[PDB]
Nucleic acid binder design. Structure first.
Ligand SMILES: CC1=N/C(=C\c2cccc(Br)c2)C(=O)N1C
Ligand SMILES: [K+]
Ligand SMILES: [Mg+2]
Lengths: 225, 215
RNA sequence: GGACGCGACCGAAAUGGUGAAGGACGGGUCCAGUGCGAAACACGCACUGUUGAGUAGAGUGUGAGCUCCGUAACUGGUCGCGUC
């Protein structure tokens, strides 16, 4: 029944501003402390800010003090994080969490939202180029063949990849994106298949990058050579 | 002074059914205001323990917490398949709050050598001015692996990037992709492109290569 | 000897003034800690702490007691005198 939904995340340039929302349901935030916690990709949890009940006292992590402002609108049962003077290292998934009721959960955060991604970068939004990773002319190495798609130079995160509209799932590996020195992301999706049906079976990678209106399907076939 | 929560180990390998313990050590007294969380890839953290030693409602009792001064431990008496994830400690004795750096708990299994594939850049990417060369290490264990790029037998450095998948939910292996990035001009100045893989499961180093013009 | 009556002295409940005492005279308040109120701070309650706190009070008590100077009910005591 209890639920927290954060929104307002997205792409912002350094020095820019951004306001996150934390919509509570199944409970009333006025009776709880509400917290903001963030997680840079591949990194641990970092406590950001909190606001106390009845007093409205606010506390902030040193790394965001003077830049961030936490607040709450009981009329909408929503909490907010106003972020000013944003920096590259502010890039993270932002969670809002409810501090539980002292008698039942102490000071533990018993409920978390799914999180909203904030990307701070001077890079422009850009759809990816999808290139084929063709199955080799050779037919060995594992008893099967390997193929895939290179999803290069998109921004920002995230992107989705499927194969044959979701019909092909087995033996699929979609790797975590990498941030290139250009400021753009890049990743690969590969799948191992029986080398005996390479020219027969159809293999299409389905790439969707919502932030750029870029949805692409690429057929991957053995190169002519 | 900010209160430090020094968590260890940073990573941990264990078999299903094993008894494991994770430690967080505070830099000063945090009383008993310590919580433990479980987090799985792409999901929000979940509360396990509060007040150092109290089991949060609905959490299985194989999870336990204890306090020994300013040292705090999370113990899983007998790991189950769904228990493999990352765990974080947190002090909430005073502001600002502090999370531990976390501990990733991964599943142990028999050594598995990687299957290695190399992919030359597509002709479509080449007409763009950039050449991406991809090397795949498929389904191996343990996670530790070494990928080297050779161009005409010259060791590359600083011009490639790696990415590794989460431990697989079925075979508990890892996969890895390395991408060598070159200008179209530099790419066409050389012939033999290779990546040499070294892994514990390999009887010896494995080289996958192609010649630029041939395929 | 005793009783009644008057006076003095002593004693005395009560009471006004006075000035030293700080926690072993207290209460109030503040502070620290812990728990509780949907509650980490702020607000309120409960518990704990004076090797937590001014006897210049920092009290919409400086309250009780005491030190010291008075008024004083009267059941008291003693002495003198008058009378029986
Ligand atoms: C300074 C001070 N101390 C007080 C009370 C108190 C009570 C018991 C022991 C001690 Br020490 C002090 C008080 O009320 N104040 C203003
Ligand atoms: K007092
Ligand atoms: Mg209080």
């Amino acid at each position: 029944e209890v639920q927290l939904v954060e929104s307002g995340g997205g792409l912002v340039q350094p020095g820019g501003s951004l306001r996150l929302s934390c919509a509570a349901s199944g409970f009333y935030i006025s009776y709880s402390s509400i917290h903001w916690v963030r997680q840079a990709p591949g990194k641990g949890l970092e406590w950001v800010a909190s606001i106390s009940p009845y007093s409205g006292s606010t506390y902030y992590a040193d790394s965001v003090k003077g830049r961030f402002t936490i607040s709450a609108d009981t009329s909408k049962n929503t909490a907010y994080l106003q972020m000013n003077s944003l920096r590259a290292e502010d890039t993270a998934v932002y969670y809002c969490a409810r501090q539980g009721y002292r008698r039942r959960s102490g000071r533990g955060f018993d409920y978390w939202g799914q999180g909203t991604l904030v990307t701070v970068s001077s890079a422009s939004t850009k759809g990816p180029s999808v290139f084929p990773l063709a199955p080799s002319s050779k037919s060995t190495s594992g008893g099967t063949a390997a193929l895939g798609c290179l999803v290069k130079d998109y921004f920002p995160e995230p992107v989705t990849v499927s194969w044959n509209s979701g019909a092909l799932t087995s033996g699929v590996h979609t790797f975590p994106a990498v941030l290139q020195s250009s400021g753009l992301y890049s990743l690969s999706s590969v799948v191992t298949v029986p080398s005996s049906s390479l020219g027969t079976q159809t293999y299409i990678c389905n790439v969707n990058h919502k932030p750029s209106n870029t949805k692409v399907d690429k057929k991957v076939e053995p190169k002519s050579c | 002074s900010d209160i430090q929560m020094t968590q260890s180990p940073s990573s941990l390998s264990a078999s299903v059914g094993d008894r494991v313990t994770i430690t967080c050590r505070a830099s000063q007294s945090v009383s008993s205001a310590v919580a433990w969380y479980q987090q799985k890839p792409g999901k929000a953290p979940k509360l396990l323990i509060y007040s150092a030693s109290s089991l949060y409602s609905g959490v299985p009792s194989r999870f336990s917490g204890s306090r020994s001064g300013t040292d705090f431990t999370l113990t899983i008496s007998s790991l189950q398949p769904e228990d493999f994830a990352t765990y974080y400690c947190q002090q909430s004795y005073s502001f600002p709050s502090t999370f531990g750096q976390g501990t990733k708990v991964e599943i142990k299994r028999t050594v598995a050598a990687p299957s290695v594939f190399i992919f030359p850049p597509s002709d479509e990417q080449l007409k763009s001015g950039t050449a991406s060369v991809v090397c795949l290490l498929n389904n191996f264990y343990p996670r530790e692996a070494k990928v080297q790029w050779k161009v005409d037998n010259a060791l590359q450095s600083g011009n490639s990037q790696e990415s590794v998948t989460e431990q697989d939910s079925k075979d508990s292996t890892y996969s890895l992709s390395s991408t060598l990035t070159l200008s179209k001009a530099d790419y066409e100045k050389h012939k033999v492109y290779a990546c040499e893989v070294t892994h514990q499961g390999l009887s010896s180093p494995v080289t996958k290569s192609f010649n630029r013009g041939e395929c």
